[PDB]
Design a protein around this ligand. Structure first.
Ligand SMILES: Nc1ncnc2c1c(I)cn2[C@@H]1O[C@H](CO)[C@@H](O)[C@H]1O
Ligand SMILES: OC[C@H]1O[C@H](O)[C@H](O)[C@@H](O)[C@@H]1O
Ligand SMILES: [Mg+2]
Length: 456
């Protein structure tokens, strides 16, 4: 059964862009949080939470948004300003581990670990330290231009004297507790709060040298997993703007498809700036075949598209019926879209049109594979070998499963195909960062694999 999953994906080839970084991870304990809040007047924390800062300019902004994430039990990603004083305050924190971060980095590593035929990863900065966090696999490749020719080089050997990007990941578990202004706050969910660096010099783009060869890169692969748009700023000091990078990124997608119509996937993320979030919808979502979102992310998209009541209902009640309705709206709105994927702590869902070449059972097989990856990663923290997948396979489907599945399954009809795999939930997960990327990329690569297998 693991064998069979691995065989099925082996011939699939993947391009991924644009974001790789170091994720410096802190596993928060009660006392770590208590110490963070005790550095401030508890009243100042409550007042700053009322303001809801969407960018971290001083440590109090961080503490406010972290408490908010713990209290609501919801993940968030919030950018920092680049100043020294703030950067240094964050360095005094003792991190427990460093690992590959960023969608394109995590997905690359996963697919190298799973031993698919080829992975081509692009990111603009590739320092030695960064490159050496990639998995050692001869067919995990980075595109270089040498004497006017495209060279695909093993990523770990392709490094140069580039700067390094570091994001800071604050992981907490269900049951974590602390006191703020007399109130004991207890985490009801295990999740993570991300402090996002957006270094001025690091652009979400393919640089001109490589960009000339995007069509050839597309022909070399079967599909593309794209993300990183979440770090685009409205303005750069050199006068470039979000619009410039978004127009360019939309064109990247057409260039990739120019000589081969590969499947492309957008992975959404928590995007603090609502103007950037809108641009991801307008420029990227409109041009891809697959989209991966959590529940909050689909609500956010729906709100951008003017479906305010449905989006707020999703946020409020998380009814699977409402999520499905939202997915259908996306399918109806975006003709290029073939599959809408939503993942929550309870399930992963695919919504497709009836005309999709895959059957409902084949869609299910994609999701069942993906859930094994995600639960393995939740248990161990990392998927280091194919053999690790036996961990995920031991964990049973969560107790809401038959029920969620039953509800969703009734929306299969003449117009739409729906598949749902309940999560295989682990009470005390080692970590949560990258679980979505793991599930989304697994499901998508499996989907592409089954399409191509059927086409022959
Ligand atoms: N504690 C956990 N234990 C096992 N699996 C987990 C989690 C959590 I937190 C999330 N997930 C799985 O990751 C996917 C992305 O949220 C979800 O869809 C889900 O499959
Ligand atoms: O999916 C997890 C990744 O996604 C995010 O968008 C973060 O920027 C990155 O730090 C993290 O590794
Ligand atoms: Mg995600």
């Amino acid at each position: 059964e693991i064998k069979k999953f691995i065989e099925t994906i082996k011939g699939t080839k993947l391009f991924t862009a644009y974001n790789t970084n170091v994720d410096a991870i802190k596993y928060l304990k009660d006392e770590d949080v208590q110490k963070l809040v005790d550095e401030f007047n508890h009243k100042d924390i409550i007042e700053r939470m009322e303001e809801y800062p969407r960018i971290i300019e001083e440590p109090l902004d961080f503490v406010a948004r972290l408490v908010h994430s713990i209290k609501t039990g919801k993940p968030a990603e919030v950018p920092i300003k680049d100043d020294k004083k703030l950067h240094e305050w964050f360095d005094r924190i003792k991190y427990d581990e460093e690992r590959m971060g960023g969608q394109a980095g995590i997905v690359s590593n996963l697919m190298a670990t799973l031993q698919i035929d080829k992975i081509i990863v692009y990111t603009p900065f590739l320092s030695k330290k960064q490159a050496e966090m990639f998995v050692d696999y001869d067919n995990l490749l980075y595109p270089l231009v040498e004497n006017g020719n495209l060279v695909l080089k093993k990523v770990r050997e392709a490094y140069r004297d580039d700067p390094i990007k570091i994001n800071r990941i604050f992981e907490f578990k269900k049951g974590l507790k602390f006191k703020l202004n007399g109130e004991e706050i207890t985490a009801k969910q295990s999740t993570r709060f991300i402090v996002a660096s957006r270094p001025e010099a690091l652009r979400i783009e393919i640089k001109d040298d490589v960009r000339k060869f995007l069509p050839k890169i597309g022909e070399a692969v079967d599909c593309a997993f794209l993300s990183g748009y979440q770090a685009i700023k409205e303005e750069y000091r050199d006068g470039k703007t979000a619009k410039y990078y978004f127009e360019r990124a939309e064109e990247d997608i057409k260039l990739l498809k120019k000589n081969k119509n590969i499947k492309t996937h957008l992975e959404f993320a928590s995007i603090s700036n609502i103007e950037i979030r809108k641009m991801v919808v307008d420029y990227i979502l409109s041009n891809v075949e697959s989209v991966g979102m959590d529940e909050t992310e689909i609500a956010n998209v729906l709100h951008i598209l003017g479906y305010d009541e449905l989006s707020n209902n999703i946020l409020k009640d998380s009814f699977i019926e409402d999520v499905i309705e939202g997915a259908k709206i996306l399918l109806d709105k975006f003709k290029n879209l073939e599959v809408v994927q939503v993942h929550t702590i309870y399930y992963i869902l695919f919504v497709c049109r009836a005309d999709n070449p895959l059957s409902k059972e084949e869609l299910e097989e994609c999701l069942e594979f993906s859930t094994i990856l995600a639960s393995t990663k939740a248990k161990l923290g990392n998927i280091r070998a194919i053999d690790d997948l036996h961990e995920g396979l031991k964990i049973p489907h969560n107790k809401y499963g038959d029920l969620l599945k039953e509800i969703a399954e009734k929306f299969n009809d003449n117009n739409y195909k729906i598949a749902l795999s309940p999560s295989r939930y682990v009470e005390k997960p080692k970590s949560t960062v990258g679980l979505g990327d793991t599930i989304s990329s697994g499901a998508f690569v499996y989907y592409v694999s089954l399409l191509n297998k059927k086409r022959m």
